[PDB]
Amino acid sequence: GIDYDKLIVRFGSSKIDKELINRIERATGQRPHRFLRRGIFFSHRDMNQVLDAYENKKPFYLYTGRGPSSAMHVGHLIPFIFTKWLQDVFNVPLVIQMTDDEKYLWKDLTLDQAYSYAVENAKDIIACGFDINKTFIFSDLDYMGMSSGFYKNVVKIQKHVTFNQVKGIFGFTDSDCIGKISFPAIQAAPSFSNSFPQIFRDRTIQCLIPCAIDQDPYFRMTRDVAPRIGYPKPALLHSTFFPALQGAQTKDPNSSIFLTDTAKQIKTKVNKHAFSGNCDVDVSFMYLTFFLEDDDKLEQIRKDYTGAMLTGELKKALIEVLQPLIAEHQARRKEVTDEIVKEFMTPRKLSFDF
Amino acid sequence: GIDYDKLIVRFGSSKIDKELINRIERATGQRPHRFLRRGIFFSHRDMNQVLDAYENKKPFYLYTGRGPSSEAMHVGHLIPFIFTKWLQDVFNVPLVIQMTDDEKYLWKDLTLDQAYSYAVENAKDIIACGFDINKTFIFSDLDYMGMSSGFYKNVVKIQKHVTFNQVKGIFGFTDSDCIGKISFPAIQAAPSFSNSFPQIFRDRTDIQCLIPCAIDQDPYFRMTRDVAPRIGYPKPALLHSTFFPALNSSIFLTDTAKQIKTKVNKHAFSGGRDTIEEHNCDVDVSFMYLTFFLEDDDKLEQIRKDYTSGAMLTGELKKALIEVLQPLIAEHQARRKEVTDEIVKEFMTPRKLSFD
């Protein structure tokens, strides 16, 4: 139905970016061997844009968002796994925003629930393996009251964005609460460095937002307001993978695969559901391509197996990567103490190494 | 045309409330010598609930606000503070004063550094009213928002339960307006709950808020009272009074004694011209200022016995306002110089305020 033989060939078609691998090798004495399939997880020129700055010693930090929902599922972990990888490759500061206030505003939660879901989620985020010395994780509700810059930038962004603009970007009506309407300024503020006195304490510092789609409402607004307050707009890591992943996972969710699920619960959920505008882009296939580290394993399945029979090893392949991935994650998350969470959420100076 | 003799008769025909004066002496220990002409200066009804609370020893704190004007303060901007200070004196209660420098930034052509500087400068004028440094927390929104574990959390709670439609009606916002304005009423409501101020009230659940405010123009404060139980908090008490406002020509606090004389003689006490660009619909700005700033209860009665067999209304009323204003501004100007930057820091420093 969805035609996976095409999707495996289309994945194979684009060769690995050896010239970029070399350019990474020069800037940092490192052999990257993942996410280098050409154009997929990032665009060749946007990486060259980053590499320029890293080679020219222009400081930049990574920024990534989060929505604290009561558990995580595998798709939500993907952005962070990639972001860690970037972070290791360039040894760059990372700011992670827990939009707990956002979840309270949009959803049926107590403040305290939304705050508790952020703190708990941070354990899953921390369990992806982020370096503490390059990583600040913060909750909007807590950080707003312990920052001499963050609210000031929120107020600046708020002055230079109208209802009309957010109405046209986010589709807010007049029935919507005033929290929702002014929130986009909160999501935009981390893209500017002086929002964090304790973390950066410095004059300009760019921002880089990986896993980021060009038609994202929050990204579009931040872009638009940035020059109006004389700040540099955040750099965006354009990719085919991420826009398609959002464009796939839009399709109803009841037994989506959770990070709490047992090895059996994984195996059940995959067989009963997985592998069965329209590019014909199955979410289960994109999970395989992201999680597979064996480069030649998809084309190995393709050549051997012939649909119906093909799906069999396609389901079996996803189990073999998801089973150890969730199990290890449970192991790691169990040793992320509340103390370690507070350590990560403590404001403190991050440095630019090269 | 405004009929000033009719208004004096209206004012005068309200009797002096000794039932209140007796009850305040019993509760506080001293008799107040101002603002007790029944119905004029506050709501007698509201003041009784205030007395019930003070007599039952329910802790309450005062909250008033301000947009710090980039141009110098008009005499009428002291009116809320002079009355708020009078409240603090009789009841000996904690007061919280909010500088809404963020409001002024959003509304005016200002830098953040400028708006804050005006907040700090306006705090001197405020402090010069004579508020108790032991019972009074002045704060900048821009500055305090980043130093409080409780304030922003309350903003967010209030934000969820107030809509654009609601604030559109009250404040008259449109889609052309910036999003900061639309969401600003949360910031204004937030000080109505003690736990916005952790270092001031130590997260005690027993405290409530008293908010003096204008009669009729209170539809916002009603909405703030409606949201309180939706987010688990007690409703703020209100103390209605005409002499609170709603939500170059004028008399400034920097003006010379003769500048005061000029401006009154020229602009005051006339149906045509006004004393303040935008000001109880029968009454003038001139008459209200006079009625407030007079401490002599019997002065307007006598201005009627004088005249009606004597001198002119406009002349006699202008006279009475000059003699009332000139000292107030002078005594303000002199006292404002004794307010050093260190005293402002003390007023603006988060610290505990006790009850008595």
UniProtKB/Swiss-Prot annotation, chain B:
Proteolytic cleavage generates 2 forms; T1-TrpRS and T2-TrpRS. Keywords: Aminoacyl-tRNA synthetase, Angiogenesis, ATP-binding, Cytoplasm, Intellectual disability, Ligase, Neurodegeneration, Neuropathy, Nucleotide-binding, Phosphoprotein, Protein biosynthesis. GO terms for cellular component: cytoplasm; cytosol; extracellular exosome; nucleus; protein-containing complex. Coiled coil: none annotated. Its EC number is 6.1.1.2. GO terms for molecular function: ATP binding; kinase inhibitor activity; protein domain specific binding; protein homodimerization activity; protein kinase binding; tryptophan-tRNA ligase activity. Induction: By IFNG/IFN-gamma. The modification N6-succinyllysine is found at K58. It is linked to Neuronopathy, distal hereditary motor, autosomal dominant 9: A form of distal hereditary motor neuronopathy, a heterogeneous group of neuromuscular disorders caused by selective degeneration of motor neurons in the anterior horn of the spinal cord, without sensory deficit in the posterior horn. The overall clinical picture consists of a classical distal muscular atrophy syndrome in the legs without clinical sensory loss. The disease starts with weakness and wasting of distal muscles of the anterior tibial and peroneal compartments of the legs. This is Tryptophan--tRNA ligase, cytoplasmic. It comes from Homo sapiens. The gene is WARS1.
